[PDB]
DNA sequence: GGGCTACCTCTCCATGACGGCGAATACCC
DNA sequence: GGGTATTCGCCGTGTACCTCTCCTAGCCC
RNA sequence: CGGAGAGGUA
C-alpha cells in the first residue's frame, strides 16, 4: 500500500527566477 | 593569461577548483591523467599536510623515502 | 558642470548644489560596490595562478638576471633605485664608474 | 530529511533518477511487447534527453517542477559553481571550536594579546576543561563535568585561567584580504561580550570600531599552538608582505597626541630655561610649572651604537622643547635623538619605527610601539584636542574671487552672445577660471588656516 | 492660535521661508492605490471591475452557452485583527460574485437564452488593508512595496558604443505591451531592418509587413517616395524637385531651357536650389548611367506578351531600359535614396526576404514561435492574429495608449488597446526617421518612462492571472456541460484563483516582511519605490545607469535614501510631496507663477511637464504679495541650472523639503552633511530601537509632528471633547455637541495597545498623554506609541557628549558611556520574545504536554503548575524548562526550553488546541479568563456607553419640558416616558431609545458570537495537537559592545562604561554623559553634528535657566518674559508666537514641559544660520564658541584647549551585542557532508572560508590548516579522536581523509567519470 | 473544505548584462 | 578549396554573517 | 536539521 514520498516532496525553491542556474 | 595559465596545468584539481569543471574533468576524463598532488591547493582538497609551510619539510621525508 | 558648488559645508548649501553633490556621492558608492566584486575576482584568479610556487631550493646557481634602473617618464625620477633594489640578491658585480672596480 | 507536518525534502537528485527510471521502464515495457517504430522512437528521445536532463541540467533548461517552472538541479551543478562542492564545502569548510562577536578597543592591552569575553572563553574551551576537571579530580566521568561547566560552578574559572594563559587563539576578519587577515594573540578575559582588540593591530584588519564582528578560532593541536606562536603572534607581524615598511603604523587618535606633544609655541611658561634630563622635563609638566611644548634647552644622553655591537654613550645640550624630552624617556637606547627633534606627524613617526626595526631588532620595536601608543592615547587625553564650528575659519577673500568669476562668467556669456566665441571655447573657458578661482579660494583658507 | 493640547510644549521653529502647502498624509501610496482596487466602480475603469469586465463574458467553443458577469461583494472578514496577528490566519473578507449562467437553443446565436440562472458564488479570499497600510498574511504584518518598471509604451533606444567595434551605432525600437507579446524592431551593421519577437531569433523586418497584407507596392509606397522618368523624345527625362538635390554632387551637368545651372564637380549649392526652384524649373534631361544606379518601384508587365520586364525592388541597367524602353512604359517610377536624407532601407530588407506571398511569410513567424511541428494555415493565422491583435493574448493599457500615441507625435491619448497596422508601420517609419538624424533617442533612467505600480495594480494583475486559469476550466467544464443539471458554483473553483493570489501575497520579492520597530521605519517601509521585482531588473545585473541619480529625480524620488551595499538605488525611497498621477508617473507639487506674482495656487507637473517649463528654486528671495527681489533668479529649464531673468519664470517651488524624504526630512542640519554620512544618517536613524522612556528631541525639523501622527502608532482622537476618563488600558473621550451626530450618539471609547510583539521583537506600547478632565481637539494625539512623546517623533535619547580624544577608548569610532547614562535606565530597550512549542502527532505515539519529565528534579518542576506551563510572570532565566513535553520512545525529554543567555518575564501565554484533543486545566484556566476579560470589556462598554446615552436623555431634559423632581424617581431606562411636545425633543428622544435597544441586541449577539470565536476550536498545521506559545521579554540595558548612532553617520560601538567620576567635568560641575572622538568629523565630512551639538547646548543652556527660574519659583511675570524672548530671537521667522494669549497655567505648564530643554526646530535646507546659534547663545548664560573649559576627572585639571560639548540626540540600534555573540565547542553536524551547521539558531560554528585558507597557506602554518579542515570538521573518526585526546590531555591528530572529499568521489563517479585513488 | 490518492509529461510562461573567447559556419574569390 | 569574418554558444560576475517567511495538486466527495 | 527567497550588518 504505497503512499509513495516523492508525492510529498517540498518544492523548496519556490520563489527563485525560472531562469537562474545552477539550482 | 592568468585565467588560462592556471586550466592548461598538469593537475587537473587545481584547474577544477577554478573556473569550468565540465571543461577541465572531461578534458582529464579523455586523457588519463594522473595529479600527483604536488602543491597547495590540491593537498588543502584531500585533507594533507600543505608542502609550504611548516609541512615541508614532511615532504622533505616523504619524497625522500618513496 | 559650468557652475561649480560654491559654498561650503560650513555655510549653507542650497537645494541644487547639494543635489548635484548627492550625484557625486551616489557614484562613489555605487563605484566601491561593483569595484569590490571585480577585485575579488582578481585576487581569486591570481592566487589560482600562483598557487603551487614554492621556494625549494637554496640557490640555483645562474648568472642572469634583469637589469634594474630607475623609472623615469618625463617628470622627476619617480622611484630610485634604493627603493627598487631594496633586498634582492644581485647578478653580477655591480661596477663602479671607475672601471674594473 | 523529516520536515514538520507530515512532509518531506529532499535534493533534486530522488526526482532526476524517478524521471529516468520511469522513461527506462517505460522503454522496457514498450520494447518487450513490440511497439510500432515512432513510438520508441519519442520514447528513446524521451529517454536520451532525461539523461541529459541529469547528468547536466544546465544546457537545456528541461527539467522543471511544480507550480514554478524552474530548472532543477543536476550532478554537474552539484560539483560546479559558487555552491557545489569545491568552493563551498572543500576550500573552505564550517569550522568547530570558533566564534564571533563585535569588537571593541581597550587600549590597556600589549599587542601580543587581546580581550575574550568569559562566557565565549568557557564555551570555546569546554574540552579542556574537562580534561583538567576529571585531571585534578573534581568529578569521575564527562556527564558530571559537563554539569559543571553547564552549571558554572566557582572552581571553573580558575581552571579556565588555568587552560588560557600560554594558548592563542586566532581572530579573523571576516572579509581577509592579506596575511595579516589573519592574526594570532593571547586571551585576557573579559567581563563583558565583546573582543577587546589591540589598537594598532587594527590598522592590519582595515577595522573600524563601528560594529565589525571578529571571529575567534582555537588551535587544538599542539603544532597548531606553535604555528600560532612562531608564525602568527602578532608580534611577529610588524612588517607587512607587500612591502617593507610597517604595518603597526599608529592610526588616528595616537598620532595626534604625539603631534600635539612634539611641538612648539613661541612664548609659554618655561621660555628659554635649562633642564637637567627628561625626567625633570616630565616632572616639570605634571606640576604645571611649564608648558608641554615651549623651548628648553636640555642635557640628553643617546647611546649611538657606532662600536661592533656594542653601544657608545654620548650626552649633550640640545635645543628642544619639553614635549620632545618627555617623549624621548620612551625611545629606546641606540636610536640618534634627531628622529623625535622634528614634528612627528604620521609619516615620521612610521620610518621612527621602520628605523627602530631596522636597527634594533624586534623586542625594542613591540615593547616601543606599546609605549608609544600608551603616551599617545595618555597625551592626546591631555590635550583635549577638540573640533568647532569656530575652528574652521573661512577666507575673507573669498567672496571678492567669486564676485569676480561672476563677473567673468558674465564677460565670457557677452562674448557668447557677441557671436565672437564658440560653445566649446565658452566651456573651456568657464572651466579654467573656476579651476583659477578655486585654486585662489584654496590658497587664501590655507595659508588663513595655518600662519593666522 | 493653538489648541489646548499645541500649547503643551511649542518648538522654537527657526525657519525663513513662509509655507504653503502643508505635507501630505505619508501614506497615500498604499491607501490610494488599495482603495482604488476594492471599491465598487463603474464605468469599468479600475478594480476588480476591470477583470471582472476583461474576462467575461467565458463562452464555450460555439457551445451556445455563455456565463456573463453581474457585480460582485464582499462580506464581513471572520476575524478582527488583534485576534488575526494572534491567531494566524490571513486578515482577508471573502470576495462573493453574483456569476449568471445563459443557455442557447440549437440554432441561436443572436436567439433569444432559453434558460438564466443566477445566484451569488464564492471565490478566493482577497486580503484586506489595515487601517495603517500594512496586511496580514499568516499572523505577521506585511507591507507590499511600490514596484517602479518601465512604462508600457514604444523606446526607441539607442545601444551605442560597445556594439561591434566600429563606431557605426546601431538603433532599436521596442513595443512593451502591459501584457502581451513584446516586439523588437532593430537594426544591423550590413543596414538592414530587423524584427524579433519575446526575444527570439531575428527575423527581417519586413516579412511582418508582408504578414499584414501588404504587397510589395505598397510597402514601398509607405516608406518612400516617387521619381517620376517619361518617355519622351529620347534620354528620357526625370521631373526634379530640387529639394532633393539638396547637398548632393551631381555627377551630370544639370540644365534647362538652354542654361547651363550646374556643371558636373559641383554640389547643388543653396543658390542652385534658389535658381532652379526661382526660375520654377520641374524636368531636366539625365544621362542614361545616372538611372542605372536607381531602383525601380513598382511592376511593369508586358501589355503584348504577358510576362514581367522588371519587378519591383529591381536596380536598372541600360539593357534592361531597353527592354521597357520598346514595350512604352511611360511613367517609370524610382525610389529617392540618398545616402544623407533617405535611407534604402527597406529596400535592402526586401532583398533578405526569403518569402513572397502572406502564407509563407506566416509559415515562417508560425514556424518561428512554435518550432518543429508542421506549419499549418489555420495554426498561423490563429498564431500571428493572437499575438498582436486579439483583446486576449495582447493588451496595451491606457497608458501605453498614451505614451505610444505621445512618443508618435499623434493627437488622441485615448483610443484601443490592441496594435493596428498604422501603429507598427509608424514605428518603423519613427525609426527610420531616427535612423536618417531627424528625432532623438529616448531614454530610460529618465522618469517620465518609468511607471510605478501599486498594491493594486499588481493585486489586481494576480486577480487577472486567477481569471485566465478559472476561464480554461470553465471553456474545458461549459464545453462538456450540457443542461440545468449544474448551477455555476458546481463549474468554478476557489483554488486558482486563492492560490495565485495567495502566491502573490504570500510570498515574493514584493511582500517584504514589515520593518516594524519604530514609526519611522514604517512610515518609511510603505513609501518605497523598487525597481526589482516581475517585470523589472534584477540585483546582480544592474549597472552604472539605473544605480545612478538622474536629473529628474528632482522632487519625486529621494536622491539621498537609499540602501548601500547590493541594491543601491534600486530601492528608492519616494519623496515627501510626491504623489502618482493618474497614469501612474511621480509628480510633485509646484506653485504656479504668472508673469509678475507668485501665485500661492499649487499644480502639480509630471517627468515631462517639468522638461518644458523653467521651474524656479525654492530658497528665492521674496517679499510681499510677490515679486522676486533679485533680478535674476537661479533655476533649471531643462535639467539644468541656470540664472535666468527676474520675469521669465512660470513655477516656483513649494517647499524646500520636497528633495528628501521622511527618512531624510528628519536630519537636522542636513544642508552641512556629504551626502554619503546623510545616507548612513538616514539609514541608521530608520533603524532605531524604542527606549524605555519617550524622550523629545532636542533638535528636531518639525516633520517630527506629522510622522508620528501620520503613521498608525498614536491614537488619534476622531473627534474633539472632553476626556471622561484616563487609563492604560483605554481613554474615554466625551464629544462635544458641535461635531455629534444626534442618532448613534454616544461618546469614544479608545482601546489602547498595551505590551505586544512587533515583528523585529521590540515592545509596542501605547500610553496615555492627556490627563483626567481636559480638552482634546479633532486630530490630536491621546496615546503615545513606541517612540513618540506628545505627539512628536523621539527615537533614541539626547545626551550631554564631548568631543576629545579620552585615552584611546574612542580610538576608531568608538563611544565611551558613562555610568549615568546606564543607571537613569535610559537606553534600556524592552524586548519581547515568542517562544513556540508545538504538539506533533509522529509515529510511535502522540506527545503529552504534562510535568512527568525524567533527568530532572525540582529545579525544573519549581516553576510549573500541575499542567506543565509555566506561570505568567514566573520570571525565568537560561536553562529553566517553560513547557513540559516529553515523546514517546521509556520516554525522552523534549521538554521546551529558555535559549540560552537570556533573562526575563513571562507576560503572556497562549495556547491552541486542535478541534479533536481533549483541553487539560491551564487551557481551560485561560479560556475562562478570556471569557471573563470579553464579558468585562463588552459590560464595560455598555455601561459606560450607557453613561452617555442616559446622560444625555438627561441633557435633553434639562430644557423643553424639565421635571427635575420625576427624572430620577423612576430610574434611568424610562425617562422618555415623561411628559414632553411632539417636536424635535421626542423624536431625538426616540432615536436615543432604538440607539440603546439596539445596543442590547448588538451587545447580546455579539456576547455569544464572541463566545463562539473564543469557545470552538483552531485550525492548525496537519499533524500537530496543540501549540502553546509563551512571550519572554527581556529588558536588555547597556554593555561595551551595542551600536549607538547618531543623526549624521556617526556610527559608533560604546566601549566602556566608566564611573561617573571619570569623566570630564566643566567649572560648573557637571559631567558630561557621552565622550567622542573629533576626528570623525574631518574624513567624514558630516559637520552638521557639530552644529547640531552646539544648537543642543543651546536648547538646554534656556532648558536651565527656565530650571533656575522655576525651582526658584518666580510669579509668572519673569517666566513670560524669558519664554517670550527665547521665542522671538533673531531674524524674521513663521513661528511669531505671543504669549498675551495664555492663560497663567499654559504658560506654567508649558515651562514645566520645557524646563528639561527647549525644544528647537531646524527644517533641512532653511534652517539656521550660525548667528542664530551665537545670538540663543548669548541669550543664555554660555560661551558664545560652544565650547567650555574642563576638568579631567581622573587627575583634576583643566584640559588645555577647550573643547567642545552640547547635546546629541543619540539613538541605538538594534544591532545588540547579545544577539551577535555565538561560540560552539562541538554541537550537531549536517547530514550529507559531516560539517558543522551553520548559524547561531542553529547552534553552529564559523566558517573559516576560502581567503582564511589562503591566509593560513601563506603563513607557514600548515598543522594549523591541517586541523582546521580535517579534525575540527569534515571527518567523524578525526574528531572523536581528537575529543578522547583532549580529554585526556594529549595533543595529536589522526587526519585521514575529509568525509566531504569522499562524497566528490561519489559525486564524480556517479557521473560517467571514473576517479580513483592510487596505491 | 478536505481526506485519500497519487504524473505513469502539458503550453505559453518569458521578455532590463556584458565582456570575452573560442568554435562552427559564411563568404569571397 | 583556403583564408578570413560573423554569428553563436558558453562562463563569469567579493567574502563572512544576522533575522524572518516558505514549503502538494486534484478531486470526488 | 533541508534549501530557497526577502530585508539588514561590515
Ligand atoms: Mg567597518
Redesign the pocket.
Known amino acids: 500500500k504505497?503512499?509513495?514520498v516523492?508525492?510529498?516532496v517540498?518544492?523548496?525553491?519556490?520563489?527563485?527566477?525560472?531562469?537562474?542556474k545552477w539550482? | 593569461?592568468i585565467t588560462?595559465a592556471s586550466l592548461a596545468t598538469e593537475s587537473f584539481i587545481s584547474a577544477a577548483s577554478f573556473?569550468?569543471?565540465?571543461?577541465v574533468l572531461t578534458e582529464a576524463a579523455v586523457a588519463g591523467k594522473r595529479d600527483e598532488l604536488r602543491g597547495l591547493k590540491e593537498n588543502v582538497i584531500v585533507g594533507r599536510l600543505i608542502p609550504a609551510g611548516t609541512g615541508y619539510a614532511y615532504h622533505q621525508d616523504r619524497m625522500r623515502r618513496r | 558642470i559650468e557652475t561649480p558648488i560654491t559654498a561650503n559645508f560650513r555655510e549653507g548649501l542650497n537645494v541644487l548644489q547639494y543635489f548635484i553633490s548627492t550625484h557625486g556621492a551616489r557614484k562613489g558608492l555605487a563605484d566601491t560596490?561593483l569595484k569590490?566584486?571585480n577585485?575579488?575576482?582578481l585576487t581569486?584568479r591570481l592566487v589560482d595562478v600562483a598557487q603551487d610556487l614554492v621556494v625549494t631550493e637554496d640557490d640555483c646557481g645562474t648568472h642572469e638576471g634583469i637589469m634594474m634602473t630607475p623609472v623615469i617618464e618625463g617628470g622627476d625620477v619617480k622611484e630610485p633605485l634604493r627603493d627598487r633594489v631594496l633586498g634582492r640578491v644581485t647578478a653580477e658585480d655591480v661596477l663602479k664608474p671607475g672601471t674594473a672596480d | 530529511?523529516?520536515?514538520d507536518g507530515?512532509?518531506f525534502?529532499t535534493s533534486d537528485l530522488n526526482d532526476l533518477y524517478?524521471?529516468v527510471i520511469?522513461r527506462n521502464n517505460?522503454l522496457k515495457r514498450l520494447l518487450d511487447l513490440a511497439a510500432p517504430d515512432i513510438i520508441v522512437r519519442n520514447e528513446k528521445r524521451?529517454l536520451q534527453?532525461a539523461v541529459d536532463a541529469l547528468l547536466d541540467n544546465?544546457?537545456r533548461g528541461?527539467?522543471?517542477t511544480?507550480?514554478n517552472?524552474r530548472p532543477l538541479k543536476s550532478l554537474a551543478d552539484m560539483i560546479?559553481?559558487?555552491?557545489g562542492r569545491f568552493?563551498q564545502n572543500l576550500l573552505?569548510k564550517?569550522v568547530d571550536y570558533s566564534g564571533?562577536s563585535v569588537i571593541t578597543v581597550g587600549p590597556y592591552l600589549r599587542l601580543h594579546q587581546c580581550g575574550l569575553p568569559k562566557k565565549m572563553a568557557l564555551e570555546l574551551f569546554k574540552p579542556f576543561i574537562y580534561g583538567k576537571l576529571e585531571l585534578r579530580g573534581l568529578a569521575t566521568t564527562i556527564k558530571a563535568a559537563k554539569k559543571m561547566v553547564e552549571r558554572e560552578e566557582a572552581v571553573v574559572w580558575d581552571i579556565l585561567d588555568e587552560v588560557i594563559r600560554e594558548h592563542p587563539v586566532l581572530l579573523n576578519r571576516?572579509?581577509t584580504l592579506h596575511r595579516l587577515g589573519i592574526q594570532a594573540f593571547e586571551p585576557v578575559l573579559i567581563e563583558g561580550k565583546a573582543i577587546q582588540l589591540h589598537p594598532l593591530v587594527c590598522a592590519a584588519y582595515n577595522?573600524?570600531f563601528?560594529?565589525?564582528?571578529m571571529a575567534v578560532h582555537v588551535p587544538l593541536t599542539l603544532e597548531a599552538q606553535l604555528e600560532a606562536r612562531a608564525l602568527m603572534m602578532s608580534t611577529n607581524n610588524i612588517l607587512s608582505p607587500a612591502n617593507g615598511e610597517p604595518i603597526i603604523v599608529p592610526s588616528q587618535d595616537v598620532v595626534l597626541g604625539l603631534y600635539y606633544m612634539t611641538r612648539d609655541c613661541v612664548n609659554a611658561k618655561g621660555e628659554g630655561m635649562v633642564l637637567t634630563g627628561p625626567k625633570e622635563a616630565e616632572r616639570l609638566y605634571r606640576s604645571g610649572l611649564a608648558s608641554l611644548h615651549a623651548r628648553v634647552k636640555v642635557r640628553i644622553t643617546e647611546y649611538e651604537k657606532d662600536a661592533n655591537g656594542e653601544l657608545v654613550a654620548k650626552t649633550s645640550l640640545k635645543d628642544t622643547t619639553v614635549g620632545r624630552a618627555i617623549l624621548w624617556m620612551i625611545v629606546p637606547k641606540g636610536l640618534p635623538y634627531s628622529i623625535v627633534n622634528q614634528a612627528l606627524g604620521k609619516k615620521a613617526i612610521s620610518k621612527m619605527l621602520n628605523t627602530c626595526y631596522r636597527i634594533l631588532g624586534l623586542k625594542p620595536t613591540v615593547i616601543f610601539a606599546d609605549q608609544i601608543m600608551y603616551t599617545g592615547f595618555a597625551y592626546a587625553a591631555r590635550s583635549g584636542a577638540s573640533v568647532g564650528i569656530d575652528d574652521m575659519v573661512i577666507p575673507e577673500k573669498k567672496h571678492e574671487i567669486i564676485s569676480e568669476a561672476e563677473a567673468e562668467v558674465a564677460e565670457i556669456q557677452e562674448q557668447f552672445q557677441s557671436g565672437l566665441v564658440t560653445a566649446g571655447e565658452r566651456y573651456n573657458k568657464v572651466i579654467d577660471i573656476w579651476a583659477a578661482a578655486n585654486d585662489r579660494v584654496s590658497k587664501a583658507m590655507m595659508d588663513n588656516l595655518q600662519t593666522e | 492660535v493653538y489648541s489646548y493640547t499645541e500649547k503643551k510644549r511649542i518648538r522654537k521653529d527657526f525657519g525663513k521661508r513662509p509655507q504653503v502647502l502643508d505635507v501630505p498624509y505619508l501614506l497615500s501610496i498604499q491607501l490610494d492605490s488599495f482603495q482604488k482596487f476594492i471599491e465598487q466602480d463603474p464605468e469599468g475603469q479600475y478594480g476588480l471591475e476591470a477583470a471582472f469586465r476583461s474576462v467575461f463574458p467565458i463562452q464555450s467553443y460555439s457551445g451556445n452557452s455563455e456565463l456573463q458577469y453581474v457585480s460582485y461583494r464582499l462580506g464581513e472578514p471572520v476575524f478582527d485583527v488583534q485576534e488575526c496577528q494572534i491567531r494566524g490566519v490571513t486578515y482577508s473578507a471573502p470576495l462573493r460574485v453574483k456569476l449568471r449562467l445563459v443557455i442557447y437553443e440549437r440554432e441561436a446565436p443572436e436567439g433569444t437564452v432559453k434558460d438564466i440562472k443566477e445566484q451569488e458564488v464564492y471565490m478566493g479570499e482577497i486580503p484586506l488593508m489595515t487601517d495603517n497600510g500594512t496586511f496580514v498574511?499568516?499572523?505577521?504584518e506585511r507591507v507590499i512595496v511600490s514596484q517602479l518598471?518601465?512604462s508600457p509604451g514604444v523606446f526607441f533606444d539607442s545601444d551605442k558604443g560597445?556594439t561591434?567595434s566600429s563606431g557605426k551605432v546601431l538603433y532599436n525600437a521596442r513595443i512593451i505591451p502591459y501584457r502581451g507579446?513584446?516586439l523588437d524592431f532593430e537594426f544591423?551593421p550590413?543596414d538592414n531592418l530587423f524584427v524579433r519577437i519575446?526575444?527570439?531569433?531575428?527575423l527581417p523586418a519586413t516579412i511582418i509587413l508582408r504578414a499584414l497584407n501588404y504587397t510589395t507596392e505598397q510597402i514601398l509606397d509607405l516608406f518612400f517616395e516617387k521619381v517620376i522618368f517619361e518617355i519622351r523624345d529620347n534620354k528620357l527625362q526625370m521631373e526634379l524637385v530640387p529639394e532633393r538635390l539638396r547637398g548632393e554632387t551631381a555627377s551630370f551637368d544639370i540644365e534647362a531651357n538652354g542654361k547651363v545651372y550646374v556643371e558636373k564637380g559641383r554640389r547643388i549649392t543653396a543658390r542652385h536650389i534658389r535658381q532652379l526652384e526661382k526660375d520654377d524649373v520641374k524636368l531636366i534631361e539625365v544621362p542614361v548611367e545616372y538611372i542605372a544606379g536607381k531602383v525601380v518601384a513598382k511592376d511593369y508587365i508586358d501589355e503584348s506578351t504577358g510576362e514581367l520586364i522588371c519587378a519591383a525592388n529591381m536596380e536598372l541597367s541600360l539593357d534592361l531600359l531597353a527592354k521597357l524602353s520598346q514595350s512604352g512604359h511611360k511613367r517609370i517610377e524610382t525610389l529617392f535614396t540618398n545616402d544623407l536624407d533617405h535611407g534604402p532601407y527597406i529596400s535592402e530588407t526586401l532583398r533578405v526576404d526569403p518569402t513572397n506571398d502572406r502564407l509563407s511569410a506566416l509559415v515562417e513567424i508560425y514556424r518561428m514561435?512554435?518550432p518543429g511541428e508542421p506549419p499549418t494555415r489555420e495554426a498561423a493565422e490563429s498564431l500571428f492574429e493572437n499575438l498582436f491583435f486579439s483583446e486576449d493574448?495582447y493588451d496595451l493599457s491606457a497608458v501605453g495608449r498614451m505614451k505610444f500615441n505621445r512618443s508618435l507625435l499623434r493627437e488622441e491619448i485615448e483610443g484601443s488597446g490592441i496594435l493596428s497596422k498604422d501603429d507598427i508601420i509608424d514605428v518603423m517609419k519613427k525609426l527610420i526617421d531616427i535612423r536618417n538624424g531627424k528625432g532623438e533617442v529616448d531614454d530610460?533612467?529618465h522618469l517620465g518612462n518609468?511607471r510605478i505600480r501599486s498594491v493594486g495594480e499588481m493585486a489586481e494583475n494576480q486577480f487577472r492571472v486567477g481569471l485566465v486559469r478559472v476561464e480554461?476550466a470553465v471553456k474545458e467544464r461549459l464545453s462538456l456541460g450540457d443542461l440545468d443539471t449544474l448551477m455555476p458554483q458546481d463549474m468554478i473553483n476557489?483554488?486558482?484563483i486563492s492560490?495565485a493570489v495567495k502566491?502573490f501575497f504570500?510570498?515574493?520579492?514584493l511582500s517584504?516582511?514589515m520593518?516594524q520597530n519604530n514609526p519611522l521605519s514604517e512610515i518609511t517601509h510603505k513609501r518605497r519605490i523598487?525597481?526589482?521585482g516581475?517585470?523589472?531588473?534584477?540585483?546582480?545585473?544592474?549597472?552604472f545607469?539605473?544605480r545612478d541619480v538622474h536629473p529628474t529625480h528632482y522632487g519625486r524620488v529621494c536622491p539621498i535614501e537609499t540602501?548601500?551595499?547590493?541594491?543601491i538605488g534600486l530601492?528608492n525611497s519616494l519623496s515627501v510631496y510626491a504623489q502618482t498621477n493618474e497614469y501612474g508617473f511621480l509628480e510633485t507639487p509646484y506653485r504656479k507663477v504668472t508673469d509678475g506674482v507668485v501665485t500661492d495656487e499649487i499644480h502639480y507637473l509630471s517627468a515631462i511637464e517639468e522638461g518644458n517649463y523653467v521651474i524656479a528654486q525654492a530658497n528665492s528671495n521674496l517679499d510681499e504679495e510677490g515679486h522676486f527681489v533679485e533680478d535674476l533668479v537661479t533655476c533649471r529649464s531643462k535639467g539644468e541650472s541656470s540664472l535666468f531673468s527676474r520675469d521669465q519664470v512660470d513655477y516656483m517651488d513649494v517647499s524646500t523639503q520636497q528633495v528628501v524624504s521622511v527618512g531624510a526630512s528628519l536630519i537636522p542640519f542636513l544642508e552641512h552633511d556629504d551626502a554619503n554620512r546623510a545616507l548612513?544618517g538616514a539609514?541608521?536613524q530608520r533603524?532605531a530601537v524604542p527606549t524605555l522612556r519617550a524622550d523629545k528631541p532636542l533638535v528636531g525639523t518639525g516633520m517630527e509632528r506629522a510622522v508620528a501622527v501620520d503613521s498608525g502608532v498614536t491614537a488619534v482622537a476622531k473627534r474633539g471633547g472632553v476626556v471622561q476618563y484616563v487609563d492604560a488600558s483605554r481613554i474615554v473621550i466625551k464629544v462635544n455637541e458641535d461635531e455629534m451626530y444626534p442618532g448613534e450618539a454616544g461618546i469614544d471609547i479608545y482601546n489602547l495597545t498595551k505590551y505586544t510583539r512587533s515583528n523585529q521583537?521590540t515592545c509596542i506600547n501605547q500610553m496615555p498623554c492627556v490627563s483626567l478632565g481636559e480638552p482634546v481637539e479633532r486630530g490630536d494625539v491621546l496615546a503615545d506609541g513606541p517612540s513618540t512623546d506628545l505627539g512628536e517623533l523621539a527615537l533614541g535619547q539626547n545626551m550631554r557628549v564631548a568631543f576629545m580624544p579620552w585615552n584611546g577608548y574612542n580610538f576608531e569610532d568608538s563611544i565611551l558611556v558613562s555610568e549615568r547614562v546606564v543607571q537613569e535606565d535610559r537606553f534600556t530597550t524592552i524586548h519581547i520574545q515568542e517562544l513556540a512549542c508545538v504538539s506533533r502527532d509522529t509515529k510511535l505515539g502522540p506527545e503529552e504536554i504534562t510535568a512527568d519529565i525524567p533527568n530532572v528534579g525540582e529545579a525544573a518542576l519549581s516553576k510549573l503548575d500541575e499542567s506543565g506551563i509555566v506561570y505568567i510572570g514566573a520570571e525565568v532565566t537560561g536553562g529553566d524548562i517553560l513547557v513540559g513535553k516529553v515523546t514517546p520512545k521509556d520516554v525522552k525529554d523534549s521538554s521546551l526550553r529558555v535559549p540560552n543567555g537570556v533573562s526575563g518575564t513571562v507576560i503572556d501565554v497562549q495556547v491552541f488546541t486542535r478541534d479533536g484533543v481533549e483541553k487539560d486545566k491551564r487551557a481551560l484556566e485561560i479560556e475562562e479568563m478570556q471569557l471573563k476579560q470579553a464579558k468585562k470589556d463588552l459590560s464595560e462598554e455598555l455601561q459606560i456607553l450607557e453613561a452617555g446615552l442616559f446622560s444625555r436623555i438627561r441633557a435633553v431634559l434639562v430644557a423643553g419640558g424639565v421635571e427635575a423632581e420625576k427624572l430620577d424617581k423612576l430610574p434611568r431606562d424610562r425617562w422618555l416616558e415623561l411628559g414632553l411636545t411632539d417636536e424635535e425633543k421626542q423624536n431625538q428622544l426616540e432615536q436615543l431609545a432604538e440607539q440603546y435597544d439596539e445596543l442590547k441586541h448588538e451587545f447580546e449577539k455579539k456576547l455569544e458570537a464572541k463566545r463562539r470565536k473564543i469557545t470552538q476550536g483552531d485550525?492548525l498545521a496537519?499533524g500537530v495537537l496543540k501549540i502553546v506559545k509563551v512571550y519572554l521579554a527581556v529588558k536588555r540595558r547597556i554593555q561595551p559592545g551595542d551600536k549607538m548612532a547618531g543623526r549624521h553617520g556617526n556610527?559608533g560601538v560604546i566601549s566602556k562604561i566608566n564611573p561617573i567620576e571619570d569623566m570630564p567635568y566643566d567649572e560648573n560641575g557637571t559631567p558630561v554623559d557621552i565622550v567622542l572622538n573629533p576626528l570623525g568629523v574631518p574624513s567624514r565630512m558630516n559637520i552638521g553634528q557639530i552644529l547640531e551639538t552646539h544648537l543642543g547646548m543651546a536648547a538646554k543652556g534656556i532648558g536651565d535657566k527656565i530650571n533656575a527660574m522655576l525651582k526658584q519659583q518666580q510669579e509668572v511675570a519673569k517666566l513670560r518674559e524669558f519664554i517670550q524672548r527665547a521665542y522671538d530671537l533673531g531674524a524674521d521667522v513663521r513661528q511669531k508666537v505671543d504669549l498675551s494669549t495664555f492663560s497663567d497655567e499654559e504658560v506654567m505648564r508649558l515651562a514645566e514641559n520645557l524646563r528639561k530643554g527647549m525644544p528647537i526646530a531646524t527644517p533641512v535646507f532653511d534652517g539656521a544660520k550660525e548667528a542664530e546659534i551665537k545670538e540663543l547663545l548669548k541669550l543664555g548664560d554660555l560661551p558664545t564658541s560652544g565650547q567650555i573649559r574642563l576638568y579631567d576627572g581622573r587627575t583634576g585639571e583643566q584640559f588645555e584647549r577647550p573643547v567642545t560639548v552640547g547635546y546629541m540626540y543619540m539613538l541605538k540600534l538594534n544591532?545588540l551585542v547579545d544577539?551577535?555573540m555565538?561560540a560552539r565547542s562541538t554541537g550537531?553536524y549536517?547530514?550529507?557532508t559531516q560539517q558543522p551547521?551553520?548559524?547561531?539558531?542553529?547552534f553552529?560554528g564559523?566558517?573559516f572560508?576560502?581567503?582564511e585558507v589562503w591566509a593560513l597557506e601563506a603563513y607557514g602554518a600548515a598543522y594549523t590548516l591541517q586541523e582546521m579542515l580535517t579534525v575540527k570538521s569534515d571527518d567523524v573518526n578525526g574528531r572523536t579522536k581528537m575529543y578522547k585526546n583532549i580529554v585526556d590531555g594529549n595533543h595529536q591528530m589522526e587526519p585521514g581523509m575529509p568525509e566531504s572529499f569522499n562524497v566528490l568521489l561519489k559525486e564524480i563517479r556517479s557521473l560517467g567519470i571514473n576517479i580513483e585513488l592510487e596505491d
Open positions: 504505497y503512499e509513495d516523492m508525492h510529498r517540498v518544492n523548496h525553491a519556490h520563489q527563485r527566477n525560472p531562469n537562474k539550482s | 593569461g588560462k573556473q569550468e569543471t565540465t571543461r | 560596490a569590490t566584486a577585485s575579488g575576482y581569486r | 530529511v523529516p520536515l507530515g512532509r525534502a524517478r524521471r520511469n517505460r524521451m534527453e544546465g544546457r528541461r527539467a522543471i511544480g507550480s517552472k560546479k559553481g559558487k555552491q568552493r573552505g564550517r564571533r571576516a572579509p577595522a573600524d563601528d560594529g565589525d564582528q | 498574511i499568516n499572523g505577521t518598471h518601465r560597445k561591434h507579446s513584446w544591423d550590413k519575446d526575444r527570439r531569433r531575428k514561435m512554435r493574448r530610460i533612467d518609468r480554461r476557489a483554488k486558482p492560490a502566491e504570500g510570498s515574493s520579492q517584504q516582511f520593518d523598487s525597481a526589482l516581475p517585470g523589472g531588473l534584477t540585483r546582480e545585473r544592474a549597472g545607469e539605473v540602501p548601500e551595499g547590493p541594491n530601492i548612513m539609514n541608521m533603524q521583537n485550525d496537519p556610527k544591532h544577539d551577535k555565538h550537531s549536517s547530514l550529507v551547521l551553520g548559524g547561531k539558531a542553529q553552529g564559523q566558517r572560508g576560502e581567503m
